[model samples]
Target: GRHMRVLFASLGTHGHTYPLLPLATAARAAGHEVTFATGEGFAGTLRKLGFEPVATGMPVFDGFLAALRIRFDTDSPEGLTPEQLSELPQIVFGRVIPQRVFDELQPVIERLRPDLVVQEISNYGAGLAALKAGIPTICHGVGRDTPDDLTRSIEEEVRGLAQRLGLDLPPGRIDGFGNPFIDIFPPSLQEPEFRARPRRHELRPVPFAEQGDLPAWLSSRDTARPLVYLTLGTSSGGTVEVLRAAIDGLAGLDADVLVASGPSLDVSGLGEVPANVRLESWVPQAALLPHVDLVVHHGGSGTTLGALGAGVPQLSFPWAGDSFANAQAVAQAGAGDHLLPDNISPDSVSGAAKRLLAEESYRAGARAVAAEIAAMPGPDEVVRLLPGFAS
Candidate 1:
């Protein structure tokens, strides 16, 4: 009941932020006092939902985004579609992102004294902070490329950084992301049958989004003509070119449309929008899933799972990291179709969206997957597992 106290820390990155919100929402409903920690930029979202938040600009954001040349907006010179955005830091590993986050959060994390630390996978510094405090940390592998046991996991690769504190993490030492990873992914959401850790936990599916209001609006839209949604979350930086080309493909479509153009995009260039189209910086996708017939997105793990959790069919324009793999999962499950950014044009985006919209088999397959997801233990179960975690 009110006895449960949790310190849920989401990473500064958008993908990492997605899974934690649903967990926080579930925890609050289950009578736990939850304190959320993340960057100052994302704190407003938590505050809007009535959770107390701890914030600091992650040390990694500025350097990473700056070095990367992140941009968006349809037709804007900076806009790049999800596929086009992968050019950043091709030289360095994704380590730079997590490193900065952990450093900025180190001092603050030590002071919070949380009972449970619910961290995103890339929030690598979190593992060290929690181990140092001896707090129970539950890691949520939010993407398709969930961390693995031994010799894998970005952790083993980053052990040298940990050496600064005399904590040279060995292969297999980090069971996974958290002390125990409660991956918010299903078996079908993976690729290559990645090595699994015996101790890791897989939880029910949920979509974490900082955006609000759109899902409800989608619910109110007329279903007679069929509804479709397009999104690629904020982290899919520089997706505007794709969106620009995509809009030309979709603007002519007959279906009613809802587009959540990430802040990286400019909507005006999508041209005199058809009356069927609606645009926003973000959408309440989980809310909209109930009503939409199809979703076309950048196939980030969060967006893919969001559509899947809703049992809606999707078309993915996956970019990098685990995205290609996660998109493949949806394709294999027969719930989605995949398109690469390199091959994309207005026609391809339209054709793929239309295919998912027209395919009954895809929708049926999604319904079956949704059943499995509905049966799984959610964050509430995560709380129940806490007795074992207590020191």
Candidate 2:
């Protein structure tokens, strides 16, 4: 068989770019030519990972948030209600962001003329551009499936855009209905309806972390003591007070705590530090997860599935977006508990941590989910299936 030129596209953030890395790397190792299109901010990082990187789309979620604020006419976009937030993917990802991506990516698609395009689900503009170029595509999932209502709403937006661009694409192809969908979320955590979709291929979620040196002390730390890892992830709407409250609570336990403050929050404002806690800008998460006993995080999909895949229990603080839904799913599965912003405090966080650490049921739930994830086909198997989609 002949080698194929494969183009991969995402939003160029940790959560978006990381999910697509496994499959992209697999394609390259399997002798296909792989090119990645993302924002300029993540181009260097992609190149470092051995893929050819092209700059496209917004550099960060903040760019999308800025647009959202202008549309909603509000300084505090985070204050949107759950119902309002639920409509975001249709308005933001569906219309606003895709227009930006399509403008940039259409030129790239014309120049590269790839045999196949693999785009993260949120990057609909990549999907649109590929369709216009007559290139086949595989819609890669970053997290849960978009809700049916939102999906319908997004289709309308895409239809309008298509009409404006004079593309005569059909409805199914426009919405990626018949295309092969590479789903990385575990079956146990996915909605029953989404699991039943035809053309869906379950790919095991592999936690992708940037290369970094682990702390020297992590290896030498007391093995008898429990280790808890906490993070809000990049692009979190969480404040310093939230971080301080979480650290204050976790430090009370008889555990060694490590917290990643992320780029959005300034650690200087965290004030007094607890002796048992260590603070860092970031961590090699995939490498560190296996060593952790528990996770306390802001419920980003990366951390949510990463911790689950590692068989570690969680205490999630659902701040915004899919985090709220992900936190609910984790709780429903009995793998962990969640707290709304209003309920988070030193006592509440400590209480939840105590329950998760002491309970055998939570660990059992996590391990069961991990076993389910292990059973799914991985990136290598999925890579072999890609060429079938190429024209």
Candidate 3:
């Protein structure tokens, strides 16, 4: 096989970035020269991971987050409506971020001249730029269920951009980019109707979490009781009440509780700590999941995959964006249950947690997903197939 120069264009947000890391890392390990292109803030993150980061000149994802209608620093909105979710493709994805990605990537691609370009499915700009460059492209699916309608408007924008660039466009298809998809989740978790979708490659999930010093308790767990990990995600800590409710709810349980307060959350005012719980600003979730019997989180893609790969049952408290959809998928798959914002209370969380620990079906469902993921082709196996997709 020829040594291929592969470029991965990624969104800096953890939800988007985390899932792609394993694939990129795998590509590098397979002896492919790999580089990452993303926003400025994410540049350092990629650099830290040992990938050469091409600066996208965009700062934090704060600009495109307007589709949420809630300021990250000021608002604590707890969930997404169907309408709000629909606006994201056109406003943030279709128009804003894609353009930024295109402007940043055009010169970079010309310099790099890679055989193939891989972008996350949400990377609208990268997709168009790669297509225009006439490079073989692949889209990586980051979530449980793919939204068929999410990117229609974005594809329309890509078509218009192609016309403006005076580039001879190839015939397009459903995703607009007409690229093969690299997916991490199994078919069982996807919608029945869409399970047979072609040109989709299933890859075993290799979840990513920043390496950090281990807490002493995490090194060894109490076998006398079930061990639970509570992580609401760094980005979606929600209201102070929700955080307090989550901690309070888990602290009283008959299990050992580990809570990640997120770096931005200051719970010093919550008062009265429970001895059953150990608190941290953040912990290595990928490392911690294997030691946990049950996991609780905000339904982000990374956390969801990490939990599933570790074969641990989950309880979701979806806060916003695609979280609502992720929560619903887990519930439908019988991997876990969710607590909506309206029903979030100490009792509600504790009761749900108890049920997950007591039920065999949830664990069985989680292990089933984990088994399927483990059996899927890994990055090394998939890397061999890239050349066949090269245009």
Candidate 4:
């Protein structure tokens, strides 16, 4: 396909922004001029990925979470009425964040004049701006598609913002994106709710590119024991206690362990490490997963997809948001198991990790998902099919 000016819009969080990078790079490689727009904090990562990153001047979502003392942790949402749950998205994401995003993005939208705008599902600002500017927009799924009911809860507020801007958004009714939705999850892992959506494009989940050098030992593959990788992604960065428990639980197994203590995590607090464990502030998960036999994580989409794509079983301890749902999906697919926070401890984590390694079914299940992903379209194929959205 010939070049098109494509604008990639996303949130600052790793789960939201990272999933879009592979496709952004692929589009550039296919000769499309791509630009990234997100909050001020995330611009650096996108620029490092070889795109011109535009900062929207909106604060990161984490800032609000901290200010509000809200956590997506395992028990973050408990005892809330269904009404509160229904209105949470609109309140948390739509009414506040997206509204600011649209306000700050006006100049960027005019200056860029992108031919198409692709937004990470969690980043509502880009779609709002795109609709206001009469630009074509596509919603890219970071984990799973937003439920239709959740979208409805936020509809009035979203439309009100558009009207205030004097733009007609959704025309009659907003069916969420109401346009092409590019979903990266393979069929086996995709939520059934997403399966029935029209104009849904399925693409292979390519792990996001990371800037790092792999340790020499990781490439040797000389060890006789299985290799286990543990990560909680950015959101769970400060879970020093959880990390310690995970390390302790898995330390007894006949396996070597690698722990990627997220940047914000305090490795010093982790106290002692077993000889079988190695800890780093970060490891290039995409590169490491290929050689890893098992993954233990917080059910973040990036890690989840990367593990499945690599054909490795997972042991998830879901912390918050869609993670709980994703964890359930992983278990249902027979690729792994999930443990809630209350059940998270050395014994529990280690046992699940051991089961994942001992059970041939988990490996077979992961391989099945991997094979399906391999058969699905890649970034290059998706780039070639961009014109399908032109209508």
Specify the highest-lDDT model's number: 2
* Candidate 3 worst ten-residue window by lDDT: 69-78
Best by TM-score: 2
Model 2 agreement with the true structure over 1-391: per-residue lDDT tens digits: 2578899999767888889999988898888888998877777778887888988766446555754674677656577786776556666666777788889987788888899999888787888788778888989998876465556676777777767777665765343635788999887678887789888888989988667898778888898999999999887657788888998889999999998887767778568778888888888999999999999999999999998899899999987657877887788778999989999999999999999999999999888888988999988998888878785
RMSD of 4: 4.4
In terms of TM-score, which candidate is stronger, 3 or 4? 4
**Best of the two (1, 4) by TM-score:** 4
Flag regions of model 1 displaced more than 4 Å.
1-5, 28-32, 48-50, 57-61, 65-97, 146-157, 172-178, 191-196, 208-212, 215-222
Q: Could you give me the TM-score of model 2 versus the true structure?
A: 0.91
Clashes of 1: 11
For model 4, residues 192-302, the per-residue Cα lDDT tens digits are: 766877888887788876767887666665578899998888865327777778889999998888888786566685687888788877788888899899999888888
Question: Clashing residue pairs, candidate 2?
Answer: none
* Residue-level lDDT tens digits of model 3 in 1-391: 4668889987766667778888888777777788888656677668877788886635435544654553233232357566655555465665566677887889989999988898887787888788778888998888765464544565665666556667555655336266788877776787554456678788777877577776887557667888888877766547678878887888788888888878656777867678878888777778788888899887877788888888899998886656777777787778888898898898999999989989899999888888888988987888778878775
* Candidate closer to the true structure by TM-score (higher is better), 2 or 4: 2
Tell me the lDDT of candidate 3.
0.76
TM per prediction? 0.83, 0.91, 0.86, 0.87
lDDT of 1 by residue, 108-204 (tens): 6576666677776666666666666677877777766544332243454456556765665664544443366776677655544442655577687
- Candidate 2 vs candidate 4: which has greater lDDT? 2
Sorted by lDDT (best first), the order is 2, 4, 3, 1
lDDT of each: 0.67, 0.83, 0.76, 0.77
Better of 3 and 4 by lDDT: 4
Each candidate's clash count? 11, 0, 0, 1
Query: What is the lDDT, from 0 to 100, of the residue 202 in candidate 2?
Result: 88
